[PDB]
A paper describes a structure:
A novel pangolin-origin MERS-like coronavirus (CoV), MjHKU4r-CoV-1, was recently identified. MjHKU4r-CoV-1 uses the dipeptidyl peptidase 4 (DPP4 or CD26) receptor for virus entry and has a broad host tropism. The receptor recognition of coronaviruses is mediated by the spike (S) protein on the viral envelope, which modulates host and tissue tropism, pathogenicity, and zoonotic transmission. Recently reported MjHKU4r-CoV-1 also uses its RBD to interact with CD26 for virus entry.
Structural analysis revealed that residues Y463, K509, H517, N518, E521, S543, D545, E547, and R550 of the MjHKU4r-CoV-1 RBD form an extensive H-bond network with residues K267, T288, A289, A291, L294, R317, R336, and Q344 of hCD26. Notably, the N-glycans of N229 on hCD26 were observed to form more extensive hydrophilic interactions with the MjHKU4r-CoV-1 RBD than that observed in the HKU4-CoV RBD/hCD26 and MERS-CoV RBD/hCD26 complex structures. Furthermore, there is a hydrophobic pocket formed by residues V513, V548, V565, I561, and V563 of the MjHKU4r-CoV-1 RBD, and a helix on hCD26 formed by A289, P290, A291, S292, M293, L294, I295, and G296 inserts into this groove. Notably, the interface formed by residues S502, F537, S538, Y540, G541, F542 and F549 of the MjHKU4r-CoV-1 RBD interacts with the N-glycans of N229 in hCD26, which is not observed in the HKU4-CoV RBD/hCD26 and MERS-CoV RBD/hCD26 complexes due to the shorter N-glycans resulting from different protein expression systems. In this work, a mammalian expression system was used for hCD26 expression. The binding affinity between the MjHKU4r-CoV-1 RBD and hCD26 harboring T288A or Q344A mutations was ~0.35 μM or 0.28 µM, respectively, similar to that between the wild-type MjHKU4r-CoV-1 RBD and hCD26. The above results indicate that the side chains of residues K267, R317 and R336 are crucial for hCD26 binding to the MjHKU4r-CoV-1 RBD. Thus, the lack of binding affinity of cat CD26 for the MjHKU4r-CoV-1 RBD is the comprehensive impact caused by differential AAs, mainly contributed by residues A292, T295, K336, and E344 at the RBD-CD26 interface. The above results implicate that residue sites 291, 292, 294, 295, 336, and 344 of CD26 are crucial for determining their capacity to bind the MjHKU4r-CoV-1 RBD.
Author numbering:
A (entry chain A), C (entry chain A): 40 to 766
B (entry chain B), D (entry chain B): 388 to 595
């Protein structure tokens, strides 16, 4: 039998199967199959065909994506995709009428459109173009221009700037439709005084002089962009005179300094909830605004503000959680850190200060998934006391002591990590089990939690995987200072615990990270174990989330202190287990893992022979404000500058004389700029440390080009095999 | 006898609504028909006196508040209106009989148009343990907003946000103000609030 | 006995001694010694002290350099040195009076001065500041501003732009004093439409956002800078009204298109010689201009123009040679390529077309060194038919058949490569022998060519070098197509020709290069031979100069064709000699050598196991116009674009699958931009070629920082030892 | 009888020296004292006629060349001068009696000042095997430079370099010209060359 080779990983020879579906009603969903979209009946399973892809054999352009309107009368076709950043992109858009079965050619959506989105019901469109918002009631009718102030790299109406896209919203858009599509709420960003990061872009052979890219990017302590919030009535749009956007201001407890907009959640058709966060991200406020029908403006009452602050660290895991309102919108459920330090569901009232925790324990609620009048459906890591798993529970709202697990013991051997997708009334729900076994997608009916049918079971892969020697995943924990710190181990096939294997520490250690979970993965670690007989291990130390705030907030204002030691201790614990060759222990990481990998190698512990760091942070003053300041504060002498200084990789350059180091970075990295690795190589050379480097031309943070992704993992494999004297 | 000097209303750049100016006329004689005829009145709304009779009565003291006000926002100044303008900029006092005059000024009038119209759309005070307590600051009728000190003459742009700390005479805390800027118009639009009183020497201010 | 280790090379433990001297008259010279300047009597040798360095213990700044005025009354002190490019720099300047022994503090020279130079006689000063020229008659008196038009990166009065500095003049200044200091001739450059190269500069850890450097740089075929020439009368400078600069235009045979100014040589006190070169650098014209005393302007007669063009290639070795006028200035000597294809001295007349070659043979005159009324002193590679040597000859002007070698047989074993420095009347001359033996500096008297005394003989090093196993240098030739192509070999100590050594090919192959000479060198090759037992070899194939134009012009418009093959053939010739292990043959180069090294490795010859290329050219359209176009023409479909395309390293990326490759480049390279190596790594990754890279942060073309120079040669040594399985 | 119409000299922007204009006056009567008195003459230099008498004589045909010329460059236009201006721009013809007038124009004169003064400092023709042969092109007295076609009205900057190929009527080759630009002055400075002739109907052009 063969082994899971690197070529298997890099050429995707053992592919997983998914089952992705859009619930279009409470008892139907859409599923694409052989390019022909099918509409399934959720209850029975009989599925007729919605739309056949041969309709667009006439189109003449390659279609990246489609988006059918909520009413099902139109389909939005996407082409000319051009990726900007992690989430942002531009493309051209054609609307195809499904009823007439004709393409619409009157008043076409412009090219280079930045964002498009249907109304949540019906067929209205809101699209952003040249940083300006346009509303299109009927797809064949003229657009109403909402904003006139959009400006390149300066003013963003309806879309995010770089740091809001990446570190706040995790999305390009700043558009939020009203639940029935009457109001269009949007944010405006103003980067007028935000400094630009500048890096060379070499395009192709033909381009004689390189481009210099310039991106508004606030590094730690710099000038942040400023944000405004507006609401426009899309029903009262007039084509004779320009449309009014009513501004909603932030609470005055936020206007006293720099702040962020972090959440926009509509509660009713006339009520919206906004959350604001101080630039010192340990104090946030929710504003609840009702639409005044008699003045046309929005009233946010001060008695309805809701302050969510933290005393041991930052608010939320990465940001304050979203509220799940009731139907009437007079109360809402929201994940809060309780008095014990664990994140659980609280039941606020819009005009009353306190809330009631409806869950409690030594575990965290990961997210609120669905909310009916009788039941609240949530996902938590409670089962078997394992933070590395996920399971779906529902709680009875008439009696908070009655809770039911819906995924725990469906197949507890194979299935321990679940995500869910409910129908529009939560009448049916699809469970997705990501591990430890092969992924398993199933349908259920909420009224009884009856298991209806199996959707995808990956048995096609299962038969393929029989002929290959797969590695196994050990997930366990160790106790340091009477605290359970979790870890995982990819063990080679036919693992013999009397032998001493080389080990390779796969590290991230970012605040609220979790690299020790139950999920099933085919990746570079599988190659290293199955083919190269290397134990790959990950560890969740101080700073890792989902284990309580005592653990997660342990690194507050002290990045690169505890999680760096804890990964070194994990290596010591593994080496003293016995089946690990302590002569050959390595470490590797990518973004915060690259930072920690370098810090560990510069620690002088003598524990690790060699390490490899891709795109690493080197000094926290080089990274963006929203992320770095969340954990580090400001780099001023009054706040935290002393540790900002005493947390640099460059400070440790002397101690790389003991290790073998490989530094890898992309020359077009918009996020962890090439500057960071450039300064490390400078520092190593000044102290006379030999090392190995590799720049990847025109590559971004997570190297995504096909040829470069293959090249990097090939290069890294040679480095590890050289470092272990492997054949 | 002295003639009531209505000159200050008619020269230079008139004050913004939140930072208005007032003239107490004590012991002088007046021609109000002349005053109103210099402009072109679009509203003349009197509460507690018939507008006809205010030009004729004899008052112990006549007061006039003047400021620049667009006819666009007429409804926000009507008695008992709910706008930011009566919360944060100007509120008509009805303890004494009063008259509201909204007028457009002609081109051949000696007034200079200010850059744009402005008004405060938020004025609240921040205190508490972590500056957590917000306390909106609404004006009593006929008095001035505390926010007018931030930017007396207008707003450079719409949405200007201001803040400063309040001295211990002002009662601690941090004052926060937001300013709305409305674009200006073809001819200058102006607002007049005329109050009168009766009592000690009721004949002090009589017509011509 | 020990070996010449890498640490010996990198820490300069075996230093050479020099003997540098300024002839201040025809029988005296200045020599600094223990920081105290000494004035030697050339004839007798008795040397009193000019100036003791303790004079400036009071100064308070570290003095980079000094420059004593021709009359000896003043010394110019240089400090705050800030290097710009190869030659350019800025510094602050203080004038110290030698007679009064006081520092001058009235009307001080400004800071950030770009160029300063005394008049050739006396104590006038001409200095450039903010791209403007200032003349200072007396060091304590106000400056007269000559030019008012200087502008950063746009207009250069009296100094060169980037490409004129580097590829035309090999100097920063565009100032040329009249021989007795009456006239100041200068060039003006105008880069208004020259495209900018832009690259990131990261400075130090502190700098949060990197600088983007922007340098006017015409790549191949781009818009070239434009040049004007002026002369100003420094005696008639008035302080009431602005000074006049009389322009001298180029000949109309040059104004019909783009051209360059390539030489400025004063002939008399009232006559100047200018040389202009067409942008197609196979046609040049010398203009001879007399100063009109009655109109104040300059007359350049058309009957005095002199056309020097080439039919087989470009004019000159890198540029048309300079003329050496007679005293009266009515005739001049100049190196020309004769009818046979060899460069020899021609004797023109200012107003007669033809010239008379006074030397002829199958060798080239390297340069004209001195010219008296009775003798002309030149240096040539004639002796023993060796292009790799240099020797000083004088020719009798009354009989061109009588020629005398003055350096050939002084010490022909130890000394074969000579340079000379004459006194101001050529009454005495100092010979400097750079190899093959230890350098030897000696004095002579021209009237008899009598050897006066030994100046420096490096015997201090000679005794040191006894205790170390030095390698030997074989210099020989091979015949291909009945043409002698020369080569050299650094052979390890105790070399045994019955053993098969690994070889490392040190390659440049640039047009008119010569890597096979007689010179003595302690460098990285000495380490590789003495310590690592590696034969280092260099070869001079087609395109190499000093061997005739048939060889040098063989690569015309075909860069990367013959010199690439010829270096591969040299490796074959060496491997079939027998004492070379053909399993281990490598190649290494730096600027054109880096280009050739990559081309050789992409050639698929199978001859070289591994190669390393620093700062290499990859596509000739990326390099500057003046150099590239000299050899390649323009990259237009009408001229040469087809070969511009078929000469790229990126084109050969497939064939690096057979070799081990190391690519090294500095991130702040102003000359061979990092772009060039960035495109190679791109090409290699797209074709899936594994290789090794190393970027050097903030480093220029010839890596000159101490820490980086040590780091690179350490890294390269590890690469070669890994490639040879060496211990 | 017709009066010699000296208007074209006095209106608009006068021509540059290398691109001058001329007026042949045949069969008219003239007042030259009036013409010269409109300006302020700084030079009146006559060769072959006394300057007094040229205002009085009767000519078969009187010709006048006018152009803009700075008094700064007076010496370059004197008879037999060696400047670029007599090689490439203008050269006085002495075959007929002539008068040179260099004058400054007053503010209250109807002439418009051109942007600056210009003149050609090089005008030569390039031919040969490799465009190797340069042949300078000097003007015959009273004729026009071939370079004037390059830029008739002046020069944008100093040192402007021009080139074009000459049609086979012009005799092949490439024409090359360089232009010097001299900064303009406080009052307009002008140049006049007045030539006269005698012969066929000597009375055609007589004074007033
Ligand atoms: C360093 O190097 C730099 C680059 O090499 C040099 O920069 C160049 O300098 C030259 C002049 O020395 C400039 O040429 C002139 O440009 C004038 C306007 O250019 C502007 O616009 C440019 C856009 O490019 C196009 O657009 C203009 C439209 O306005 C167009 O005309 C032009 O030709 C071009 O196609 C823009 O890039 C520039 O930055 C400028 O802002 C242009 O008007 C000039 O034409 C003049 O001059 C020439 C010769 O002198 C004549 O042949 C023309 O007919 C025209 O002449 C008219 O104007 C002159 C005043 O400028 C007068 O002398 C004349 O009397 C005449 O006026 C009469 O004539 C009219 C008919 O033409 C009549 O109708 C009127 O009634 C008037 O009475 C000329 O092309 C370059 O543009 C400039 N390039 C750059 C990039 O800057 C720089 O000089 C060097 N510096 C140093 C210190 O060495
Ligand atoms: C560096 O080299 C330059 C030349 O490149 C020398 O400069 C010339 O120096 C000579 C001195 O030998 C000067 O010539 C002399 O000029 C005298 C007149 O001076 C002025 O004349 C008029 C004023 O009417 C001005 O226009 C003019 O510019 C001068 O300012 C003459 O009287 C001399 O001529 C005498 O001798 C000749 C024979 O030799 C006779 O035929 C005459 O009739 C007369 O008797 C003499 O010609 C010359 O003007 C300078 N020219 C320039 C451009 O500088 C420097 O002197 C030299 N310096 C050093 C230190 O070496
Ligand atoms: C020109 O104007 C001046 C006043 O500036 C006047 O004295 C003179 O007479 C006028 N001459 C002509 C011809 O208008």
């Amino acid at each position: 039998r063969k082994t899971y080779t690197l070529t298997d990983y890099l050429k995707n020879t053992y592919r997983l199967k998914l089952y992705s579906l859009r619930w279009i009603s409470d008892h139907e969903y859409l599923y694409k199959q052989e390019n022909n979209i099918l509409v399934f009946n959720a209850e029975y399973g009989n599925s007729s065909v919605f739309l056949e892809n041969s309709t667009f054999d006439e189109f003449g352009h390659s279609i990246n994506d489609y988006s059918i309107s909520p009413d099902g009368q139109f389909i939005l076709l996407e082409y000319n995709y051009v990726k900007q950043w992690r989430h942002s992109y531009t493309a051209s858009y054609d609307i195809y009428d499904l009823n007439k079965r004709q393409l619409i050619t009157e008043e076409r959506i412009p090219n280079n459109t930045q964002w498009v989105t249907w109304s949540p019901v019906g067929h209205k469109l809101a699209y952003v173009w040249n940083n300006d918002i346009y509303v299109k009631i009927e797809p064949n009718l003229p657009s109403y221009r909402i904003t006139w102030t959009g400006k390149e790299d300066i003013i963003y109406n309806g879309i995010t700037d770089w740091v809001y896209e990446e570190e706040v919203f995790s999305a390009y858009s700043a558009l939020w439709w009203s639940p029935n599509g009457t109001f269009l709420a949007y944010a405006q960003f103003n980067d007028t005084e935000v400094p630009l990061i500048e890096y060379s872009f070499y395009s192709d052979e033909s381009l004689q002089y390189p481009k210099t890219v310039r991106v508004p990017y606030p590094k730690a302590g710099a000038v942040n962009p400023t944000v405004k919030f507006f609401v426009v009535n899309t029903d009262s749009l007039s084509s004779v005179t320009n449309a009014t956007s009513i501004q909603i201001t932030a609470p005055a407890s936020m206007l006293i300094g720099d702040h962020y907009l972090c959440d926009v959640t509509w509660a009713t058709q006339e009520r919206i909830s906004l959350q604001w966060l101080r630039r010192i991200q340990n104090y946030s406020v929710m504003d609840i605004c009702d639409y005044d029908e008699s003045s046309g403006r929005w009233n946010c009452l001060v008695a309805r503000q809701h302050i969510e602050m933290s005393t041991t660290g930052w608010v939320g895991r990465f940001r304050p959680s979203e509220p799940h309102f009731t139907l009437d919108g007079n109360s809402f459920y929201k994940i809060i850190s309780n008095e014990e330090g664990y994140r659980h569901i609280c039941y606020f009232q819009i005009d009353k200060k306190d809330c009631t925790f409806i869950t409690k324990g030594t575990w965290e609620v990961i997210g609120i998934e669905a909310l009916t009048s009788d039941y609240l459906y949530y996902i938590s890591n409670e089962y078997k006391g394992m933070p590395g798993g996920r399971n779906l529970y529902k709680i009875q709202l008439s009696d908070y002591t009655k809770v039911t697990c819906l995924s725990c013991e469906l197949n507890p051997e194979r299935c321990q990590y679940y995500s869910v997708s409910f129908s529009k009334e939560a009448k049916y729900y699809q469970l997705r089990c990501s591990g430890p076994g092969l992924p398993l997608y199933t349908l259920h009916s909420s009224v009884n939690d009856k298991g209806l049918r199996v959707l995808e079971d990956n048995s096609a892969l299962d038969k393929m995987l029989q002929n290959v020697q797969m590695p196994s995943k050990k997930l366990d924990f160790i106790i340091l200072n009477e605290t359970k710190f979790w870890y995982q181990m990819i063990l080679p096939p036919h693992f013999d615990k009397s032998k001493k294997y080389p080990l390779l520490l796969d590290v991230y250690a970012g605040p609220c990270s979790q690299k020790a979970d139950t999920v099933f993965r085919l990746n570079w670690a599988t190659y290293l174990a199955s083919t190269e007989n290397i134990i790959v291990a990950s560890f969740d130390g101080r700073g890792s989330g989902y284990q309580g705030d005592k653990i997660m907030h342990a690194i507050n204002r002290r990045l690169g202190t505890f999680e760096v030691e804890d990964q070194i201790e994990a290596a010591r614990q593994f080496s003293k287990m016995g089946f690990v060759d302590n002569k050959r222990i390595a470490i590797w990481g990518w973004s915060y893992g690259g930072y920690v990998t370098s810090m560990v190698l510069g620690s002088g512990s003598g524990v690790f022979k060699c390490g490899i760091a891709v795109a690493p942070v080197s000094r926290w003053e080089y990274y963006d404000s929203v992320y770095t300041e969340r954990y580090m504060g400001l780099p001023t002498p009054e706040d935290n500058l002393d540790h900002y200084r005493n947390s640099t990789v460059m400070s440790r350059a002397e101690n790389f004389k003991q290790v073998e180091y490989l530094l890898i970075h992309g020359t077009a990295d918009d996020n962890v700029h090439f500057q960071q690795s450039a300064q490390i190589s400078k520092a190593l050379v000044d102290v006379g440390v030999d090392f190995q480097a590799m720049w990847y031309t025109d590559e971004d943070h997570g190297i995504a080009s096909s040829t470069a992704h293959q090249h990097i993992y090939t290069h890294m494999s040679h480095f590890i095999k050289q470092c272990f004297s492997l054949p | 006898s002295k003639e009531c000097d209505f000159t200050p209303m008619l020269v230079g750049v008139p004050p913004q609504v939140y930072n208005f100016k007032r003239l107490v006329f004590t012991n002088c004689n007046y021609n109000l028909t002349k005053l109103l005829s210099l402009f072109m009145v679009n509203e003349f709304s009197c509460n507690g006196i018939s507008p006809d009779a205010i030009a004729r009565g004899c008052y112990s003291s006549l007061t006039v508040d003047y400021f620049a006000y667009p006819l666009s926002m007429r409804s926000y100044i009507q008695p008992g209106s709910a706008g930011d303008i009566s919360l944060y900029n100007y509120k008509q006092s009805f303890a004494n009989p009063t008259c509201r005059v909204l007028a457009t000024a002609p081109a051949n009038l000696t007034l200079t148009k200010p850059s744009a119209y402005g008004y405060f759309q938020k004025c609240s005070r921040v205190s508490g343990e972590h500056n957590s307590v917000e306390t909106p600051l609404y004006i009593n009728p006929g008095e001035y907003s505390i926010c007018r000190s931030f930017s007396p003459y207008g707003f450079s742009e719409d949405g200007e946000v201001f803040r400063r700390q309040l001295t211990q005479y002002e009662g601690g805390g941090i004052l926060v103000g937001v300013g709305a800027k409305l674009a200006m118009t073809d001819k200058l639009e102006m607002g007049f609030i005329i109050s009168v009183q009766y009592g000690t020497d009721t004949n002090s201010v009589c017509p011509m």
